Design a protein around this ligand. Sequence first.
Ligand code: 017
Lengths: 99, 99
Amino acid sequence: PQITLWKRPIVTIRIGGQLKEALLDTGADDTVLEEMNLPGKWKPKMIVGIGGFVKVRQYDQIPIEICGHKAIGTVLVGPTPANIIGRNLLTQIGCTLNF
Amino acid sequence: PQITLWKRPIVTIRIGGQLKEALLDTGADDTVLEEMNLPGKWKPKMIVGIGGFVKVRQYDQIPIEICGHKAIGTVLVGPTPANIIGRNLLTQIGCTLNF
Ligand SMILES: CC(C)CN(C[C@@H](O)[C@H](Cc1ccccc1)NC(=O)O[C@H]1CO[C@H]2OCC[C@H]21)S(=O)(=O)c1ccc(N)cc1
């Protein structure tokens, strides 16, 4: 699809058997989701945003479907005000900016 | 141009007679720049990011050139760890997501 930016680029994703909504966020290096349960090992990570540093849990090689496209990659989980799909997963579904 | 997302989508902008770099950020409603001087009236505004609420100054109808495209729009100024061009200005230069 071609998504214009008059509205937030929110799409439906499926992960760990749940349907959630998330932001396609080219300003994010990494995908970060609101608190949820994921299986397997995780390591503590820190990220920075507007507001400062935030502590998160990193899970790797997590299957996720994004607006109909299936992907596998790293997912961070923590106290984000928004589910965001960052560049690490946007590249997996062939997402680009165009103008 | 078509910009892939293996790297941060950083472009050169010109604003208040300065050249700066900024991130094309579909996950931002609003354009937010690191501390700088702009002419005219400004109102205090609050935004939220990953690390909480942040107080910023809002300036309206500011000319800005972004990767060669001229635009006019609202610019927020405050303690952001990055210059970010948000949807309010991405729409002005005809920027879309495609996958
Ligand atoms: C500031 C950027 C370098 C990075 N941010 C991504 C950014 O797109 C966030 C993404 C975002 C979105 C909503 C809430 C928090 C963070 N947007 C944001 O801070 O924008 C603010 C300015 O305009 C407003 O519109 C939306 C929030 C406001 S970030 O959320 O802090 C971030 C940092 C690292 C990762 N891996 C993921 C996300």
